[PDB]
Amino acid sequence: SKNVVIYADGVYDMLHLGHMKQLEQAKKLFENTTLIVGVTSDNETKLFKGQVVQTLEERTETLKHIRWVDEIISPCPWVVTPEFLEKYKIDYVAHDDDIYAWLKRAGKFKATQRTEGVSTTDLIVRILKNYEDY
Amino acid sequence: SKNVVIYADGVYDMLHLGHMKQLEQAKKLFENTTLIVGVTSDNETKLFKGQVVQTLEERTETLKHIRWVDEIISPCPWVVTPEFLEKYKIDYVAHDDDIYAWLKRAGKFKATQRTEGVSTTDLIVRILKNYEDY
Ligand SMILES: OB(O)c1ccccn1
Ligand SMILES: OB(O)c1ccccn1
């Protein structure tokens, strides 16, 4: 019925079918949505998560081509706060399953899923199998 | 003004920013367009072009998430024919610069561009530079 603002965030390094399926799932949680995607900065990613191949600019420019994405916040904050949700009038945070306990308490948490084995790194492995060990 | 059917085709193996930028360019050739994207079959790709990492199903399922894509023909014919254009009411073929001489004669050819250095294979190279030769 009414339009619902959905927020999802992540690194989106080397975007693959698994990311795109997650975004599609967040986008379709309700009939009418605006999906805002938050892309994490290079420094914080490396400091808290580990290695990141593509810069912030590249990760963001790729996401702009995904049909489910309605707005991008780049860089986004590393931690979602209740004031961040207020600022951008966000109704739900979409994320895959506690740092989100407060989101669930407020009724603002919606789960989405991973798809294993569709990743960019996985494809390089399929390339190398064509080259037997001996 | 009027709606214009654009056709672009290719392998779309390991879809990257370079593919997505090409699609965006085809999609925006005119104000109002329908972009049909043709995805080549596995056999013909291997027989005429060479190695292809992802199957037809995977290459197609990824393209479905790109915002510029309005319809996918999967598999598409390896060679575009004047009867193929008639069948799908195609006004222009979008492709990067003769097998397309007849397209240009008919006023149905529109050039688009590559973006070098944005490829999936290129990113694996950036990963490995973190591992000095010695
Ligand atoms: O990819 B992550 O686990 C992450 C980190 C901070 C904010 C959002 N996502
Ligand atoms: O990627 B290709 O050069 C190609 C081959 C046949 C039809 C369309 N594109």
Q: What is d(CA B35, CA B3) in angstroms, rounded to the nearest whole number?
A: 10
Q: Where are the domains of chain B?
A: 1-134
Could you tell me if B68 lies within 8 Å of chain A, comparing CB atoms? yes
Is the CB of B126 less than 8 angstroms away from the CB of A53?
Answer: yes
Asked if residues B101 and B10 have their Cβ atoms less than 8 Å apart, the reply is no
Experimental technique used?
Answer: X-ray
Q: Say if residue A75 is preceded by a cis peptide, omega within 30 of 0.
A: yes
Chain breaks in chain B (C to N over 2.5 A) after: 97
CA distances to A10, B26, B70, B113 from B9, in Å: 32, 11, 13, 14
Header resolution in angstroms: 2.1
* Gap from B122 CA to chain A (nearest CA, Å): 11
Alpha-carbon span A132 to B80, nearest angstrom: 37
φ/ψ (deg, to 5) at A120: -60, -45
- Helix, strand or coil for residue A9? strand
Give me the sheet containing B71-76, strands edge to edge: B71-76, B33-40, B4-10, B92-95, B109-111
- Return the CA Rg of chain A: 16
DSSP A77: P
Q: For chain B, give me the number of helices (H) and strands (E)?
A: 6, 5
In this structure, the number of other CB atoms found within 10 A of the CB of residue A20 comes to: 24
Question: Which residue of chain B is at minimal alpha-carbon distance from A60?
Answer: B17
Helix axes B56-63, A17-27, angle to 10 degrees: 40
* Yes or no, beta carbons of A123 and B124 under 8 Å apart: no
Residue having the nearest C-alpha atom to atom 9 of ligand 2: B10
Task: Report d(CA A18, CA B62) in Å as an integer.
Answer: 10
Q: How far apart are CA B19 and CA B60, in angstroms?
A: 13
Strands of A32-114 (E only): list them. 33-40, 71-76, 92-95, 109-111
Alpha-carbon span A21 to A30, nearest angstrom: 16
Of B20, B69, B124, the CB nearest to A124: B124
Q: What is the DSSP letter of A89?
A: T
